[PDB]
C-alpha cells in the first residue's frame, strides 16, 4: 500500500529527472542544421523485376548478403528463395504451419529461418549434403506467435514473439541462451546493429528498447509514437534507428543523444507503416504503407522525395540490398517487386 | 562460356520443376476452405468440433474439404495475429446463449470482427451453441434477460420465427432476441460484401457440418456471381 505509492512516486520523480536531462542536451533540431545542405532532388525508381510464384499473401522477405538472393514467406505455407537477377526461383520449402509471419536469411547464406502462429522458429539447412532442404532445428520456447527473427551467426539467432519478450537462441543446443524482458505489449520487429553487439526492438506499447546481447539488459528505452510500432531499422553507422507505427508517421531516434531527431509524416497519409529501411548512405528512408504504396523520405530534411507504386494490396515487407543497389518490396497481392 | 550456359540451364530446369509443384499446390489450395473458429471460455466451441500456438481440424462434407483453425496458444490481445485471416472463407463464431452475463462481451467481439479493415469482407457463420440450457434457464424464471438487456421487455417474437414443435413460447422469444442482437450489428455496416448466418445449436446437434457446408455454398456463390458482374 504505502510502499507501492512511495515506489511509484520515486519512479515518477526519477522519470522527471530523465526528461530534464534529455531536454538539457537540446541545442538545435536536425532540421535547423540541415538548412545548408542541398536537396536530394526527385528519386524515381522503376520496377526492374516482378517475382510471382506465391499463392497467398506475402508476409516477410529478407535479402541475402550477396545482394542477389532473397527469401520470402507466404501464408499458403511456402518459403521461396529467388535469384533476383534472373527471376528464377532456387528453392520452394513447404512449411508445416501455414501461418508464417517472419523469415530470415543467414548472413553466410547456409540457413533460412521462419516462424509464425505456431510459436516456433524453424531453421532450414539450405546447403544440405544431399541437396534437399530440411528442418535443421525447431525452437519451441516461446508462448506466443513469432513476429521477427534475425540470424547472428550460424549458431545464434535472436527472436521476438507476441509474448512480449525477445530471446537469444543457441541452435546447436536448441535452448534460449538469454531472454530479454521489459516490453509490455507484443514485440513486433527487431533490428541488429552493424556490429551485432546490441539490437533495438519495437513492440505494441509505443516504445522501443535497446538491448545488450551479451549482458541481456535493456540499456535504453525510446518513448515516441502514439500507437503500435510495426517496423524498426538501424542507421548504417549504427548510432541511430527509425521506427514506423500505426499512427501514420516515422521517427528517427539517436542512441547517443537519447532523443528523437526527426518525424516523417504528411497530412495526406493516415495509414500505418508496415516496414522501414534505410539507404546505403542513410540518406533515404523507405517506408511501406497500408495504402498499397511505399514512400521515399529524405532522412536529413524530412521532405518526401519519391513514391513507389504498383502493388494491388498493402505492402507488408521492404528491404534494401547490402550493396545498396536495389530495394525489394513484398505485398499482400503475393508479388515482390525489385526497384532501382 | 559453356560453363555459364550450363549453369543457367540448371537454374531454368530447377525453376521448371518448382513451378510444376506450385501448380499442383494451387489446385489443392483453392479447392479447400479455411475457417477461423473463435469463441470464448463457455462458448462450447470445442463441442462443435466433431472430428500449441494454433489448433487444426479437417472435416469433409460431400467430398469437399474444410480446414478449421482454433488459435488457443496466444494471449488475450488479438489485434495483430487476427490479420492473418483476411482470406478465410468464413469465421465460425460460437457464443453460449445461456450466459446473459457474458453475452455483451460476445457482441463487442463480434462488432470488432465485423468492422475491421482487414476482415471487412469475411462472412461469419454464427452458432448459438447452448439452447437446451437456455430453455431450462427461461423455464425456471429465476434469471431475467431484462436485467442485462433492458430492451427485451419490449421485444416480440419475429413473425418469420419457426419454433421447434413443442417448445414453450417464452423460450422462442428469448431465442430470437439473442439472435437479433447479433443481426443488428451485422446489418448496421455490412454493405453487401459479407453476411451473417445465425444457427441455433445444442451439444447433441449432429447436423452442424452440413450447415457450414450450406453456408459455404452461399458465400462462394455470391463471389462467383460478383465476378460475372451479375450482382
Amino acid at each position, epitope marked *: 500500500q504505502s510502499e507501492l505509492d512511495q515506489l511509484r512516486q520515486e519512479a515518477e520523480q526519477l522519470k522527471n529527472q530523465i526528461r530534464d536531462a534529455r531536454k538539457a542536451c537540446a541545442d538545435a533540431t536536425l532540421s535547423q542544421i540541415t538548412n545548408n545542405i542541398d536537396p536530394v532532388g526527385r528519386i524515381q525508381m522503376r520496377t526492374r523485376r516482378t517475382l510471382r510464384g506465391h499463392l497467398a499473401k506475402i508476409y516477410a522477405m529478407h535479402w541475402g548478403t550477396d545482394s542477389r538472393l532473397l527469401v520470402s514467406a507466404s501464408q499458403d505455407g511456402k518459403l521461396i528463395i529467388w535469384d533476383s537477377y534472373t527471376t528464377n526461383k532456387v528453392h520452394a520449402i513447404p512449411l508445416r504451419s501455414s501461418w508464417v509471419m517472419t523469415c530470415a536469411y543467414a548472413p553466410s547464406g547456409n540457413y533460412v529461418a521462419c516462424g509464425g502462429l505456431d510459436n516456433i522458429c524453424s531453421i532450414y539447412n539450405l546447403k544440405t549434403r544431399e541437396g534437399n532442404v530440411r528442418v535443421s532445428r525447431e525452437l519451441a520456447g516461446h508462448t506466443g506467435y513469432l513476429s521477427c527473427c534475425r540470424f547472428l551467426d550460424d549458431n545464434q539467432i535472436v527472436t521476438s514473439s507476441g509474448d512480449t519478450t525477445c530471446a537469444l537462441w543457441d541452435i546447436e543446443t536448441g535452448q534460449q541462451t538469454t531472454t530479454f524482458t521489459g516490453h509490455t*505489449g507484443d514485440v513486433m520487429s527487431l533490428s541488429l546493429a552493424p556490429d551485432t553487439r546490441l539490437f533495438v526492438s519495437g513492440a505494441c*506499447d*509505443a516504445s522501443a528498447k535497446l538491448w545488450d546481447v551479451r549482458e541481456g539488459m535493456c540499456r535504453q528505452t525510446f518513448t515516441g509514437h502514439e500507437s503500435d510500432i510495426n517496423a524498426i531499422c538501424f542507421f548504417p553507422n549504427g548510432n541511430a534507428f527509425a521506427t514506423g507505427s500505426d499512427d*501514420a508517421t516515422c521517427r528517427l531516434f539517436d542512441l547517443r543523444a537519447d532523443q528523437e531527431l526527426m518525424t516523417y509524416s504528411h497530412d495526406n497519409i493516415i495509414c500505418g507503416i508496415t516496414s522501414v529501411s534505410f539507404s546505403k548512405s542513410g540518406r533515404l528512408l523507405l517506408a511501406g504503407y497500408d495504402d498499397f504504396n511505399c514512400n521515399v523520405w529524405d532522412a536529413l530534411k524530412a521532405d518526401r522525395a519519391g513514391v513507389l507504386a504498383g502493388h494491388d494490396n498493402r505492402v507488408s515487407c521492404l528491404g534494401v540490398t547490402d550493396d545498396g543497389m536495389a530495394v525489394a518490396t513484398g505485398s499482400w497481392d503475393s508479388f515482390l517487386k525489385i526497384w532501382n | 562460356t559453356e560453363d555459364q550456359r550450363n549453369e543457367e540451364k540448371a537454374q531454368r530446369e530447377a525453376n521448371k520443376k518448382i513451378e510444376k509443384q506450385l501448380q499442383k499446390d494451387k489446385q489443392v489450395y483453392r479447392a479447400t476452405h479455411r475457417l477461423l473458429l473463435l469463441g470464448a471460455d463457455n462458448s462450447g466451441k470445442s463441442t462443435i468440433v466433431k472430428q500449441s500456438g494454433i489448433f487444426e481440424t479437417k472435416f469433409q462434407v460431400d467430398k469437399v474439404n474444410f480446414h478449421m483453425f482454433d488459435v488457443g496458444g496466444q494471449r488475450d490481445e488479438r*489485434r495483430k495475429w487476427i490479420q492473418c485471416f483476411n482470406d478465410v472463407t468464413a469465421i465460425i463464431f460460437v457464443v453460449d446463449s445461456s450466459d446473459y452475463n457474458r453475452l455483451q462481451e460476445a457482441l463487442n467481439l463480434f462488432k470488432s470482427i465485423w468492422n475491421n479493415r482487414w476482415l471487412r469482407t469475411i462472412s461469419v457463420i454464427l452458432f448459438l451453441n447452448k439452447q437446451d440450457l437456455l430453455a431450462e434457464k427461461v423455464l425456471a424464471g429465476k434469471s431475467k434477460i431484462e436485467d442485462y438487456f433492458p430492451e427485451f421487455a419490449r421485444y416480440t417474437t419475429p413473425e418469420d420465427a419457426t419454433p421447434e414443435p413443442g417448445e414453450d413460447p417464452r423460450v422462442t422469444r428469448a431465442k430470437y432476441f439473442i439472435r437479433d442482437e447479433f443481426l443488428r450489428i451485422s446489418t448496421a455496416s455490412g454493405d453487401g460484401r459479407h453476411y451473417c448466418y445465425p444457427h441455433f445449436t445444442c451439444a447433441v446437434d449432429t447436423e452442424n457440418a452440413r450447415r457450414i457446408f450450406n453456408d459455404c455454398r452461399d458465400i462462394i456463390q455470391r463471389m462467383h456471381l460478383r465476378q460475372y458482374e451479375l450482382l
Partner: nanobody, 128 residues
Framework: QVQLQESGGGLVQPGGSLRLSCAAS????????MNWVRQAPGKGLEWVSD????????SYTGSVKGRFTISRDNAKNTLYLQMNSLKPEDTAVYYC?????????????????????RGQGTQVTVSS
C-alpha cells in the same frame, strides 16, 4: 509518452452520483475512440461505454444504460463519465482506455488483462 490519468471519486451512498475525469496526453485525442472499462472485485474487466472521435456515436452497456453518460472535450483532451443512481453492484475500479489505432471503429483488446493504452484506474465504492 502515451499516458491516461483518471481522477474520479471514493465512497458514495446508494442512489448518489459521481463524475470521473480522464486527462489524456501523449497522443492526438481527437483521432481516437475512447472507452470506459471497469473491473469488479473478484471479477474480470468488462466494457462499460465508449464515445466516438466526434462524440456523435455513443454506446453503453446494458446494465448501466440510462444511468451513466459518456462525453469528451477534444479541445482540452479530457474524457468524462457521469454516473447517477449508483447501485451496490457498481463498486469497482474504473479505467479510461483508448482504442489501439486512430481513425478506426473496431477496438480490439481493450478489455485484456494487460493493455498498454489503459489508465491506472480509479476506485469507486458504494456502500451504506
Amino acid at each position: 509518452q502515451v499516458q491516461l490519468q483518471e481522477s474520479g471519486g471514493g465512497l458514495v451512498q446508494p442512489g448518489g452520483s459521481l463524475r470521473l475525469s480522464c486527462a489524456a496526453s501523449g497522443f492526438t485525442f481527437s483521432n481516437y475512440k475512447m472507452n470506459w472499462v471497469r473491473q469488479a472485485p473478484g471479477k474480470g474487466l468488462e466494457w462499460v461505454s465508449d464515445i466516438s472521435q466526434s462524440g456523435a456515436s455513443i454506446s453503453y452497456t446494458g446494465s448501466v444504460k440510462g444511468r451513466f453518460t459518456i462525453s469528451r472535450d477534444n479541445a482540452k483532451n479530457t474524457l468524462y463519465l457521469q454516473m447517477n443512481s449508483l447501485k451496490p453492484e457498481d463498486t469497482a475500479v474504473y479505467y479510461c482506455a483508448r482504442c489501439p489505432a486512430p481513425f478506426t471503429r473496431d477496438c480490439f483488446d481493450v478489455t485484456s488483462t494487460t493493455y498498454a493504452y489503459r489508465g491506472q484506474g480509479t476506485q469507486v465504492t458504494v456502500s451504506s
